[PDB]
Specification:
homodimer, mainly beta, Cathepsin D, subunit A, domain 1, seven-stranded mixed β-sheet, 1 helix, binds the ligand COc1ccc(S(=O)(=O)N(CC(C)C)C[C@@H](O)[C@H](C[C@]23C[C@H]4C[C@H](C[C@H](C4)C2)C3)NC(=O)O[C@H]2CO[C@H]3OCCC[C@H]32)cc1, binds chloride ion, binds sodium ion, Protease (chains A, B), Aspartic_peptidase_AS (chains A, B), Peptidase_A2_cat (chains A, B)
Chain lengths: 99, 99
């Protein structure tokens, strides 16, 4: 699809068996999901944006379905009010910014 | 252009006659630029980033060129890890997300 930017670019995702709403975010290097359990190994990470940093858990090799398109990659889990699909997974679904 | 997301989508902007680098950020509602001098009056705004809430200076109706495309709109001035072009100006330059 072609998604307009008149509104936040929100899509449905599936991760860890759960359906969630997430923001397609070209400004995010990495994907950041609100607190949830994921299987496997993880390690701590700090990520920074406006207002400073948050601590997250980094899970590698996690599959996400994004608006119907499957992708695999690293997923960060931590205290965000909105799920963020970052560039590491946007590339895998072929997303581009066009103007 | 059609911009892929394997690297950060950085562009050159021109504001106040000065060239700056900025990130095209579909996860940003607003445009936020590092401390600089702009004309006219400003109004207060609180924005909530991943790390918390910060105060910025809101300048309305500012002339800004983004990757060669002319825009005139609101610019927030304050401490950001990188200059970000948010949806208020991405819509002026005609940007969409596509996959
Ligand atoms: C290394 O990988 C990472 C490291 C950092 C992040 S980041 O911090 O989230 N950020 C990175 C940017 C700031 C370089 C993505 C950005 O797109 C956020 C995204 C985000 C994501 C959720 C929901 C909201 C509030 C915050 C949490 C930040 C928008 N937007 C935002 O700061 O926007 C403000 C401007 O205009 C206003 O709109 C409304 C929100 C505040 C400002 C993500 C992955
Ligand atoms: Cl990855
Ligand atoms: Cl590609
Ligand atoms: Na893993
Ligand atoms: Na000033
Ligand atoms: Na003004």
């Amino acid at each position: 699809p072609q998604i307009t930017l008149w509104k936040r670019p929100l899509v449905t995702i599936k991760i860890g068996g759960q359906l969630k709403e997430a923001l397609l975010d070209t400004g995010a290097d990495d994907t950041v999901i609100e607190e949830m359990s994921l299987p496997g190994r993880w390690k701590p990470k700090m990520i920074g944006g406006i207002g400073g940093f948050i601590k997250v858990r980094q899970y590698d090799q996690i599959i996400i379905e994004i608006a119907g398109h499957k992708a695999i990659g690293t997923v960060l889990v931590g205290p965000t009010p909105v799920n963020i699909i970052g560039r590491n997974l946007l590339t895998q679904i072929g997303a581009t910014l066009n103007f």
